[PDB]
Amino acid sequence: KSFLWTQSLRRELSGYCSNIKLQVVKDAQALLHGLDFSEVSNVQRLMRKQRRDDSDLKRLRDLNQAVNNLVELKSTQQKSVLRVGTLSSDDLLTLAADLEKLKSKVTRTERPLSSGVYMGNLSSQQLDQRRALLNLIGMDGVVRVWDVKNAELLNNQFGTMPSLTLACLTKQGQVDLNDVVQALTDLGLIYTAKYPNTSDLDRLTQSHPILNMIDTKKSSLNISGYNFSLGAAVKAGACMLDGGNMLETIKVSPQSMDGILKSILKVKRALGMFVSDTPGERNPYENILYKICLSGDGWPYIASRTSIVGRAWENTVVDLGLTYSQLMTLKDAMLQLDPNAKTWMDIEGRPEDPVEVALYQPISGCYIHFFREPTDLKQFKQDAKYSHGIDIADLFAAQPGLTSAVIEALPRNMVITCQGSEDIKKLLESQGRKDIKLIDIALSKIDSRKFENAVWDQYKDLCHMHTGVVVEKKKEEITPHCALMDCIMFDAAVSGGLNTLVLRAVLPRDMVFR
Amino acid sequence: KSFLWTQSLRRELSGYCSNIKLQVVKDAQALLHGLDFSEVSNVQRLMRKQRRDDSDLKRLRDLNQAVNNLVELKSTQQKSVLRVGTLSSDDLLTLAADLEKLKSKVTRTERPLSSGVYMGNLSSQQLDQRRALLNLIGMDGVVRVWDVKNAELLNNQFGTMPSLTLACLTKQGQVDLNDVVQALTDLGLIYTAKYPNTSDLDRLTQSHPILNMIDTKKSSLNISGYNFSLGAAVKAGACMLDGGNMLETIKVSPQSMDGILKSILKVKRALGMFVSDTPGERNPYENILYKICLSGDGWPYIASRTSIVGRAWENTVVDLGLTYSQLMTLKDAMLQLDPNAKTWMDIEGRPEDPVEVALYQPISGCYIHFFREPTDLKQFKQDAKYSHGIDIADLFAAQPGLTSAVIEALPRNMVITCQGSEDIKKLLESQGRKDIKLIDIALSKIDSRKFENAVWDQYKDLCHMHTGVVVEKKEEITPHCALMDCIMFDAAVSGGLNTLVLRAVLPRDMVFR
Amino acid sequence: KSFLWTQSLRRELSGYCSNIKLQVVKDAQALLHGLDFSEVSNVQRLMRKQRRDDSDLKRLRDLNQAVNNLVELKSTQQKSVLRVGTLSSDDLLTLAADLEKLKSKVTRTERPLSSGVYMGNLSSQQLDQRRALLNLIGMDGVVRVWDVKNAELLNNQFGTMPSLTLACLTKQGQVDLNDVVQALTDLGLIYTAKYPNTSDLDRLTQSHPILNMIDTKKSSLNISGYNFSLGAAVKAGACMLDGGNMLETIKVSPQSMDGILKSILKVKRALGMFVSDTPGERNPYENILYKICLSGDGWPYIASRTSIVGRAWENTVVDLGLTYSQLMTLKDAMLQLDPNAKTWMDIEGRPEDPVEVALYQPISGCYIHFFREPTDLKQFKQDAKYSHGIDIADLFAAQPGLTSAVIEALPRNMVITCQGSEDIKKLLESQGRKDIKLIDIALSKIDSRKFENAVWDQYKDLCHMHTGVVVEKKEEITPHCALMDCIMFDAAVSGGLVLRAVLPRDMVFR
Ligand SMILES: [Mn+2]
Ligand SMILES: [Mn+2]
Ligand SMILES: [Mn+2]
Ligand SMILES: [Mn+2]
Ligand SMILES: [Mn+2]
Ligand SMILES: [Zn+2]
Ligand SMILES: [Zn+2]
Ligand SMILES: [Zn+2]
């Protein structure tokens, strides 16, 4: 059923496939020669930890950039732009659709590994429902695997490579290289007829003892390229064979990129392939579509991709409220909120025409931040003059529907704290949520903006929306008001000071803009 | 199309599958210590030949017997009589049907290797139609691969056996046994997912270089268990798994045989499996059905069956004109004859009611010999006492429609010599054949039976139908046989009886029901 | 590669061409004066209908008569019998094999419009494999364009003639006659160099605004000559130039038909031309060989072939087991059947040697009916006396092989109703199609023949195969027809009592 998709894709794309054994074995032997395999063991030890940080990530990345200096099979950073040539106008619509579906699927699978999910003080059903997602995606009260300052540094660091695999099995398994090649050759042949299972690897193990090391019924989620998964072994086995149509052996180029995708959409239409609305393991169509859109120059499956920054939906653009798919990602990202924690909220613009919305939980250092186009532009210029200093031409790019979707998804029975309950009340009540209880702090003007300078020095990087000169009639310039910076400084006003805390965004950055 | 047929039978016969990996390696280890592999070489040399004689079969049977004596995994002579129990009445009706069609297909595929096909003086169409039968089945004027005294001695001698295969690759291929067990396992694993082919064997040889011994582009037809076919290698691989629903491991017993046949039928029913009415390689259903019905006790696929007598349709029977598939076997049987050669004919019983019919070709030595149930009980009795001495009770088990079908399939424009034409004329006539010219030679009473005693002395065993005491106007005389008349009327002409072993055109099973 | 074939044919057939720039306009003028273009717009309306019947075909055929009555460039009824002479015995065999291929292509493209294809309860893949087919040829469940009682009235009615195109562009486009000639000539000068496309005519229209009535897509299939296709304008623009060896201008005669055929087969041989076995539009080779073999008198491209009767393999014959080509015709003929509906089956003779075979679906009203040669005569000559009464000389001409070819082409899972089973079971099992379930209705022999004399009164003309006198053990009785048995047994279950052949009319007898 998932091997059927794979089979049809082999035939259709067989003309882009080739023998690569010599290039692979060369990289394996070069790793066997150059690489510090005790550091391979060190990175594996770090992947056994349930909780990992920046020191673990640096070690992984350093080992990644050590492998990358020794292999000749690498993918280069290449942007890709697609138009009506070769691909039909109908084909680019489908791609755009499937890519934004993929976007949702991959963000809901991988992001909670870094962003985290709240597993503390919740109802019995909610925990059961959160546990089911975290069982599925491979995963105080906030549980996460990667506690990092920059989660973008987790991109493309976890892919599996045939040559690295072949080298790792040879050194760590303590047998000759050829034995390993002749082992994955027999595995590679199982794969020409079925996706290999537990019993398959068992009986080969009797003739090739190496295949013990490999873990068969482990997931491909929350693993590195240094681990001995079923997928890494199967992939490495596909490249040792003498031909022919093995999908792993695809190379992409600017000259070949469109045709592969055109051929992918032909199979998809013939068999009814689709991007899953579920988080978890990638299906055959999800896997190929991501690996090709990741780079316009390289080998989608088997190359070195650790040099590549960004995602597949970013590295490839289509030139032509919230989607059900976006709604899902948003609803999963918000499970990061502790509903029992103290929560600030602030807005810029009048409550019935908001242009900036923020929420802030000071103890976890997690925040919601987003934007909206105004309706009353004639009133927007007034607030640009005297309050927020936002230019509307920079709000054009704000993703629509975000205002209602966040206020709808807010934890029920949460208590929101605000400097002036007035407008916040008329906002939540309007967006359908009267239930949310509100505190009024009621500070004075001098005491609310006491830590205004302190907050902008530490956190300026988190909002770039405020450009316009703001005045205060007596005219003289003042600091423009950010909705986010307001929240932080109002918490500091009450606290009596401001700590150094690395803030974590609840929303993905891909969601704020279009 | 047919790997599913296997995959489905695998799923339903699971409980009959088993672990024999050890017992095969044990039987190979015994062959490695006991078998003369130089004699294996000698038999393989005989299989490379086009024409094979009685001495080649003697060597082949002697070696098979030596293999047989050493292996612990053998099949036993166990006959099966099927009764309504585990199998429903319809299940049994389906079994009987298929065994008739299977009988036809396997006779048409195997028997011409011995019986032969005339390939001399014919129309271009007749030769192309015939040479296209030879490539379907993997095969003076007569073409044959086996020229033997008795073609029952060919039966069950050619099967493949994993332990023999295992033993032969080890000793002839000059590698250790352990590395042979390694190689076959990986092939056996592939066999779970697909039937391995050209490249599948090519790429496997790259780690295990014992596998270029095995021939890929060679069929299963016209080869012995000593040859390294893909099927023998694939078969042996199946045994290399401690588990897996492989049909090759199955054990049959008087207790389990019905239930096995029941399970096969469900798979056949479900998918729509069938016996193909075209000669050639066996389909998975034809294969399983044959091997199971040969012996009620033993291992259908993997045992030594070299000591088993009878074809599977004789060893297993159901208890509760010709069939379409009997006809195609009959038409295929007739191709042995030289249509241009000298050909005799003779009948016993009235031309309107023949009880015995025989045709004889004196040069190739081949004959048609069959019987028929009469209708004129009155005329029969006086003929019996004056001519053939055939007991009417011995004729009820004769195949009906055999007169029609044989006379039809006789080649157009043949020349028949006969003693007395009036009779032969009326029988060929009322059947569509006026095209055949008849030569009546003028042999008087005395001369036509000069070598009568000589013919019966030499050929008695060919006819057992004449038991009654025949008399002339009184004293006893020798009963008239259609076939013995044909031979002796030829003897009169030639001035001497020939000294040869005769070959039958008709499959022996086909004469009686 | 198809304009190559055009070009190459043009040079080799240069001397059977003339000019015709006078008579084309002459007949176009004789149309301007004496033809109502309201009925022409009425025809365009009818061809715009998604379903069409006998009354719409009447309005077409009468207009194909009225145009034929005025014009002096016409083809007339002329049969051709190809003998050796100019065409070597090797040319004849290549011409007989190609016309046979051509039969299979033209039938699979044009016939489904009338006969219909079932697009109801089927597997997605079937709905894929069958819609693919429709978009190639330009097309309850059964979808059809022409629903007519006589489908032979459809033949030679959709033809395209330049003069008819000329007179149509003039009156309907409201420009002067000359401006139509000026516009199409300029398109004809493009036809000497390449086959005009989307942009060719788009730029022509910039000087010739009258050329906007014309489509690039689509097509050249379920259109009539009253439409404005690309080809109609192209053919017209060819007959506007002086000389140049223009294919469209070819006139055939009983003295010249062999040499023109002799010419074609050289170019085919020299290039690699052949009759496509895939349905759709004609390649230039299919089109030339078809237009010529239609008639041996007139202008195969530009004449008034609207009163010509019978197809090109019928109107032209050669004088010296089914063919690969006919089996694909048969498989696309069995697509008409609704496999999810009440279906009968009946045969004559014994199951191991059937001489007449029938299947019938009442609700739609379609049937399968064919004959076979017997093998056993002793049994056939008795069945003739006491069951069917068919003469053996009538059974030689029946197409051999249809019996197994139809049975295998049956839909999988279909359920048959019969009277009785057993011998229907014996037949579908010899062929090895057990998957088919059988219902015996098992009526009494008197109850089976209640509506006997009624069915032979409404459907007699559908079978002319029963000649001999069938007797009962004696008195004369009405012979048994396998097809007439299908309809009467249906009536005995219905209590009461059109028909469309599933099998091609041309495939029953060879
Ligand atoms: Mn990175
Ligand atoms: Mn504010
Ligand atoms: Mn191995
Ligand atoms: Mn005699
Ligand atoms: Mn009937
Ligand atoms: Zn801001
Ligand atoms: Zn005898
Ligand atoms: Zn009839």
Give the rounded distance of the alpha carbon of B37 from its chain centre.
29
Query: How far, in Å, CA of B9 to CA of B408, rounded?
Result: 42
Query: How far, in Å, CA of C246 to CA of A389, rounded?
Result: 76
In terms of DSSP bridges, do strands A366-371 and A504-505 run parallel, antiparallel, or are they unpaired? parallel
Nearest partner of C28 among C253, C225, C208, C290, judged by Cα: C225
Q: Does B204 touch chain A (CB under 8 A)?
A: yes
- The answer to whether the CB atoms of C434 and B324 lie below 8 A apart is no
Q: How close is the Cα of A77 to the center of ligand 1, in Å? A: 11
Same domain, A178 and A261: yes
Contacts of B100 in chain C (CB under 8 A): none
A168 annotated as ligand-binding: no
Same domain, A284 and A368: no
Contacts of C435 in chain B (CB under 8 A): 272
Same domain, A315 and A348: no
Residue of C nearest to B405 (CA): C376
Query: How far, in Å, CA of B7 to CA of B11, rounded?
Result: 6
What are the helix (H) ranges across B320-420?
A: 324-333, 377-383, 402-409
Same domain, A137 and A105: yes
Same domain, B121 and B218: yes
Collapsing DSSP to helix, strand or coil, C305 comes out as helix
Q: Does B3 touch chain C (CB under 8 A)?
A: no
- Distant-in-sequence, close-in-space partners of B441: CB < 8 Å, separation ≥ 6: B417, B418, B419, B489, B493
Counting other chains too, the contacts that C427-434 makes at CB distance below 8 Å and 24 or more residues apart are C427/C347, C427/C351, C427/C354, C430/B324, C430/C351, C430/C352, C431/C404, C431/C407, C432/B274, C433/C407, C433/C408, C434/B272
> Do residues A247 and A301 make contact, with C-beta atoms less than 8 angstroms apart?
yes
In the Cβ-directed half-sphere of B281, how many Cα atoms lie within 13 Å?
Answer: 10
State which of C341, C363, C386 marks the end of a domain.
Answer: C341
Q: How close is the Cα of B189 to the center of ligand 3, in Å? A: 10
Same domain, C387 and C451: yes
Give the pair of three-digit tokens for residue B484.
Answer: 């013995």
Please name which ligand lies nearest the alpha carbon of A159: 1
Phi, psi angle pair for C448, to nearest 5°: -75, -25
Phi, psi angle pair for C74, to nearest 5°: -130, 155
Nearest partner of B318 among B511, B90, B105, B95, judged by Cα: B95
Query: How far, in Å, CA of B52 to CA of B65, rounded?
Result: 19
C356 annotated as ligand-binding: yes
Same domain, C448 and C484: yes
Phi, psi angle pair for B498, to nearest 5°: -75, 165
Question: What CATH number is associated with residue B492?
Answer: 3.30.420.410
Nearest CB partner across the interface for C352, out of B272, B324, B432:
B324
Nearest partner of B408 among B385, B372, B436, judged by Cα: B436
Query: How far, in Å, CA of C457 to CA of C476, rounded?
Result: 18
Q: How close is the Cα of B474 to the center of ligand 4, in Å? A: 21
> Do residues B47 and B227 make contact, with C-beta atoms less than 8 angstroms apart?
yes
- The answer to whether the CB atoms of B272 and C430 lie below 8 A apart is no
Containing structural domain, residue C22: 1-341
Same domain, C116 and C225: yes
- Distant-in-sequence, close-in-space partners of C287: CB < 8 Å, separation ≥ 6: none
Same domain, B459 and B435: yes
Q: Does A177 touch chain B (CB under 8 A)?
A: no
- How would DSSP label each residue in A335-354? GGS-TTS-EEEEEES-TTS-
Query: How far, in Å, CA of B76 to CA of B295, rounded?
Result: 7
Question: For chain C, which chains pass the contact test of at least 3 CB pairs under 8 Å?
Answer: B
Residue of B nearest to C431 (CA): B277
Q: Does C432 touch chain B (CB under 8 A)?
A: yes
Residue of A4, A185, A207 for testing the chain B interface, max B β-carbons within 10 Å: A207
Structural domains of chain A, count: 2
Give the pair of three-digit tokens for residue B434.
Answer: 């006026």
Q: How close is the Cα of A346 to the center of ligand 2, in Å? A: 5
- How would DSSP label each residue in B263-311? HHHHHHHHHT----SS-SSPPHHHHHHHHHHH-SSB-TTTSB-TT--S-
Same domain, C321 and C348: no
> Do residues A189 and B208 make contact, with C-beta atoms less than 8 angstroms apart?
no
| Burial class for A442, CB neighbours closer than 10 Å (0-12, 13-18, 19+) | exposed
Distance from the Cα of C471 to chain B's closest Cα (Å) equals 25
State which of B312, B341, B370 marks the end of a domain.
Answer: B341
B388 annotated as ligand-binding: no
Query: How far, in Å, CA of A512 to CA of A398, rounded?
Result: 6
Nearest CB partner across the interface for B272, out of C352, C430, C435:
C435
Give the number of other Cβ atoms within 10 Å of residue A46's Cβ: 18
Query: How far, in Å, CA of C16 to CA of A467, rounded?
Result: 84
State which of A278, A311, A341 marks the end of a domain.
Answer: A341
Size of interface A-B (CB pairs under 8 A): 46
Distance from the Cα of C435 to chain B's closest Cα (Å) equals 7
Same domain, B243 and B223: yes
Residue of B184, B207, B239, B246 for testing the chain A interface, max A β-carbons within 10 Å: B207
DSSP state, residue A229: -
Contacts of B188 in chain A (CB under 8 A): 203
Residue of B nearest to C435 (CA): B272
Same domain, B335 and B347: no
Give the CA distances from residue B129 to residues B75, B126, B133, B280, B335, in Å, rounded to whole numbers and listed in that order: 39, 5, 7, 15, 11
Residue of C nearest to B408 (CA): C376
Tell me the residue type at B233. Answer: A
- The answer to whether the CB atoms of B274 and C430 lie below 8 A apart is no
Query: How far, in Å, CA of A228 to CA of A232, rounded?
Result: 7
- The answer to whether the CB atoms of B185 and A200 lie below 8 A apart is no
Q: How close is the Cα of C468 to the center of ligand 8, in Å? A: 12
DSSP state, residue A296: S
B481 annotated as ligand-binding: yes
Q: How close is the Cα of B465 to the center of ligand 7, in Å? A: 6
Residue A369's H or E segment, with its range, is strand A366-371
Residue of A178, A202, A203, A242 for testing the chain B interface, max B β-carbons within 10 Å: A203
Beta bridge partners of residue A505, listed in sequence order:
A367
Query: How far, in Å, CA of B427 to CA of C261, rounded?
Result: 56
Query: How far, in Å, CA of B213 to CA of B216, rounded?
Result: 9
> Do residues A430 and A471 make contact, with C-beta atoms less than 8 angstroms apart?
no
E strand spans, A35-187: 80-82, 117-118, 142-143
Residue whose token pair is 């309050």: A387
Residue A138, sorted as left (phi over 0), alpha (psi -120 to 50) or beta, turns out to be left
